[PDB]
Design a protein around this ligand. Structure first.
Ligand SMILES: [Cl-]
Ligand SMILES: [Cl-]
Ligand SMILES: [Cl-]
Ligand SMILES: [Cl-]
Ligand SMILES: [Cl-]
Lengths: 440, 432
């Protein structure tokens, strides 16, 4: 028996001196449970919008995203935890190696009565990717204790969401009923866009609470400790020739999965388009992906299980998130490549030769160069290789040297150094040359 | 929490006939899920259960452990499982129809709540709505929503919950009664053409809504108003997601023919079969709507994500209460599902084949001579074996209401169609 009451939830980093910097209202759904270590749970939606004061992309529950991801104090202008800019609101786990993550106090106003949960830790965020309910997040955690309050700890109307912001938030839902699991083998650069109809992904901190009231002579400086950071997903896809685009894509994906288990993935809630639209993205640069029944095409769709893995034990790079009300294919690609929608990734490389010559005599040298698109790209540097032929070699600085005796076509390849995997090529043919050579 | 919910038609004299335990899935809210509106302006409950059909030990009849909710949703009369309306059953299936729902107030229930050794009850409840889940991974979940007059705490137990409630033997039977086959089929049929299609459903819901309006209480009437609420328009609708392509239906012919029929046909006889249909006895829950409006707008456009299917069941006439009906069983087959669709009961045999006969087996009717035509209807157990008579691809023959056949003036095939509603036909070719 759950009595449904008019409830308002607020989270704070403080117990006194509450203001709009350290406290925020949380727009919880009808499913909200708490009791008594105290345990709590509630849901919200990923609702990205333009903050009026800063003009930056934000979510109305950013303090929860921060507390899930970091042990430091909030700094939206930084590069870790919850952080943002005019292109997107971001979250990363690079600053999560702490016994205790950033502490929150959950204030509950219900039927003119106040209470609060003192000293909370956000253990888990489960994100829904069901096409009919995209971006629902179920938050769960614990608190040291639930305490009734005799009066208002602060003015909820002042501290809470104002009418103007509430209306903006209500129009910020990810409404496009589509999710795409983008999967890329970084060794071959083979990519696939898998439509997702069902499932969830979970960010779990595996927190262990210490049994309180166990008398210690010297106070134990933590009330709990984080466990292994786990970023996983259990999805359902509609995988076949039609859904991927062609029978060759589908056959190539089956071939790839037989020999490749590690991929760079991106789960795009709301899909990706060339015009500015809302989306929430989860990126895992090195994920273990399992699609066992790929060759079985059935009405239940196909199971896709993933486990994001860090590069090193405590790198905190298992994955990261990006949310915006105005994402595009371009800024989603930026997020996937660089970790930020605002940081331009390389999109195209045109290889050029000195004088636009397509031939080169034996023993001569030819300087190659690149025209990298877009010019706003963060890192425009390239690596140089010969991918076809043997009549020339190339320097690390793109100086092509024709062999002194060999002849033939060579394919010069420039590859982006920024993680995009973008390549550009030029064919140069080494020619014999008119030099009057003689037998000595 | 360890909450136990019971529903009853009475406030005293509780027994196993008038009271039953309800196996609620996860809490009963009391604020919730589209309940009643309140007229003459100057409370809501909600919980979920599963459709769990099983054989009752005492009667050997098919039943569900929440039959009193199905009865209260569908009827204003007292419960009578041996009847033909509301919640009713037999050895083949548990059924629900809406033929006895033309009442201001439907059958009242009292919801008793035992939670942490503390009792309370919601006095005088109306079931406004039942929303049934057709998601392949959670088939047959029902979300019930309604209103009551007030929630009242109780100082002592109103009855012994262990005697009134579900016993260990029945509980175990119920726990093995889930519709486990992850498949749903929306069977649609154009009754004019007899063209039928089995559309696989992967998601959605159907809703049975009573549109109840509660009267604002504590309103001074000189003569007491004898109702506290009134039912509105009975609405049976669904919003589904179908897997509709060349391979899902069975062939590209079927898919192309379904697109054709939808462009010119809006009204169909539909059956939503939760759990699928097979030739061996298996559990299933079926919703039938004999006169439904069906809309699949993106049938062509959609290729492989999912196709929206919206339907609205419509009665045959005013106050008929025949918008649709339900049938549940732990042992349904395609044969007894077909009986439910045709006759409203899995136990009532529908016609499956008709062989057209003559006086003997004579085909030599040459000119202006009378010949009595007859039928051999299969199965012999069919309830209604009556047939209508017509002339299909006929040159100069005449047919009456009975089986009499004659061709006048030496001018130079006969078809029997079941009255039953099955649409089964049989023919015979005559010489002339
Ligand atoms: Cl800090
Ligand atoms: Cl972090
Ligand atoms: Cl936390
Ligand atoms: Cl040249
Ligand atoms: Cl030369």
């Amino acid at each position: 028996l759950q009595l449904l009451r008019n409830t308002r939830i607020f989270v704070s980093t403080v117990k006194t001196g509450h203001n709009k910097t350290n406290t925020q209202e949380i727009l919880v759904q009808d499913d909200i449970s708490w009791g008594q270590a105290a345990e709590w749970s509630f849901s919200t939606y990923i609702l990205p919008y333009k903050d009026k004061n800063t003009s930056k992309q934000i979510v109305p529950d950013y303090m929860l995203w921060h507390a899930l991801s970091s042990g430091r104090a909030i700094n939206l202008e930084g590069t870790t935890g919850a952080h943002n800019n005019a292109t997107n609101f971001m979250v990363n786990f690079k600053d999560n190696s702490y016994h205790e993550l950033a502490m929150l106090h959950i204030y509950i106003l219900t039927d003119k009565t106040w209470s609060y949960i003192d000293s909370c830790q956000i253990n888990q965020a489960e994100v829904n990717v069901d096409i009919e309910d995209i971006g629902r997040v179920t938050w769960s955690g614990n608190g040291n204790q639930l305490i009734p309050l005799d009066e208002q700890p602060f003015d909820p109307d002042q501290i809470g969401i104002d009418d103007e912001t509430y209306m903006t938030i209500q129009g910020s839902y990810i409404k496009n009923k589509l999710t795409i699991l983008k999967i890329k083998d970084m060794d071959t650069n083979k990519s696939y866009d898998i439509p997702i109809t069902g499932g969830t992904f979970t960010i779990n901190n595996n927190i262990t609470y210490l049994t309180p009231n166990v008398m210690s002579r010297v106070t134990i400086p933590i009330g709990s400790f984080t466990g292994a950071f786990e970023l996983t997903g259990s999805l359902t896809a509609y995988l076949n020739d039609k859904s991927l685009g062609s029978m060759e894509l589908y056959k190539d994906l089956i071939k790839t999965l037989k020999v490749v288990n590690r991929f760079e993935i991106a789960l795009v809630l709301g899909g990706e388009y060339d015009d500015e639209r809302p989306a929430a993205i989860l990126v895992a640069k090195q994920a273990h992906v399992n699609i066992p029944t790929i060759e079985t095409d059935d009405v239940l769709g196909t199971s896709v299980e993933f486990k994001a893995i860090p590069s090193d034990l405590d790198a905190g790079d298992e994955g990261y998130l990006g949310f915006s009300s105005k994402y595009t294919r371009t800024t989603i690609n930026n997020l996937i490549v660089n970790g930020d929608g605002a940081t331009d990734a390389v999109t195209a490389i045109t290889v050029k030769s000195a004088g636009n010559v397509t031939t080169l005599n034996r023993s001569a040298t030819l300087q190659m160069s690149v025209e990298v698109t877009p010019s706003s790209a963060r890192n425009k540097e390239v690596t140089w290789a010969i991918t076809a032929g043997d009549a020339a070699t190339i320097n690390a600085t793109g100086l092509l040297r024709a062999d002194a005796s060999k002849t033939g076509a060579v394919t010069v390849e420039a590859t982006a150094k920024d993680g995009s995997g973008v390549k550009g090529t030029k064919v140069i043919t080494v020619t014999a040359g008119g030099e009057n050579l003689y037998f000595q």
